[PDB]
Ligand binder design. Structure first.
Ligand code: HEM
Length: 153
């Protein structure tokens, strides 16, 4: 489980992300798409983007980054008591968007990398370990909903 001190590390760095939600969101999605190109194919909205420069110039991509980080922040601020928020997300990602759990692992790695690049002083090893645990909890709870619906695999 996460301890109170671990949650405090997570939420202290998250308060810094919220001073620039759009910029963080852009960086995280670009990192995902460049490191794991198969993920771009799940987005009919974005699959025309071929270069990093094109990704950086897209306002629609920046808008989706804000949607993703706003939803994640709402989950993290519940400190584990996130059923109401998480259940609808799991349902749409399993049955409509068809996102494998592995791609949730990939985006979690992208989040960690961008937080370390933008906030080294508040993102030392202790904070990294707490954020990894928070994102593991997120994935574990989505995976349990996927299995109920027959999408875990
Ligand atoms: C931190 C993880 C993630 C969060 C919090 C998140 C959140 C959201 C939210 C709030 C929406 C809009 C409402 C909905 O459709 O449920 C959405 C849409 C979507 N997400 Fe996720 N997402 C995450 C990861 C991913 C990943 C890894 C992929 C693909 C590789 C993905 C693919 C999509 C798609 C295709 C849509 C629909 C976009 C559109 O065409 O409007 N998501 N996501």
């Amino acid at each position: 489980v996460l301890s109170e001190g671990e949650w405090q590390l997570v939420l202290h760095v998250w308060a810094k992300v919220e001073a620039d939600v759009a910029g963080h969101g852009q960086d995280i999605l670009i990192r995902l798409f460049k490191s794991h190109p198969e993920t771009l194919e799940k987005f009919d909205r974005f699959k025309h983007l071929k270069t990093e420069a094109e990704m950086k110039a897209s306002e629609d991509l920046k808008k989706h980054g804000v949607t993703v980080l706003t939803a994640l922040g709402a989950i993290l601020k519940k400190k584990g008591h996130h059923e109401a928020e998480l259940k609808p997300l799991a349902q749409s990602h399993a049955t409509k968007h068809k996102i494998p759990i592995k791609y949730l692992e990939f985006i979690s790695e992208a989040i960690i990398h961008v937080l370390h690049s933008r906030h080294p002083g508040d993102f030392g090893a202790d904070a990294q370990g707490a954020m990894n645990k928070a994102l593991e909890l997120f994935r574990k709870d989505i995976a349990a909903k996927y299995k109920e619906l027959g999408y875990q695999g």
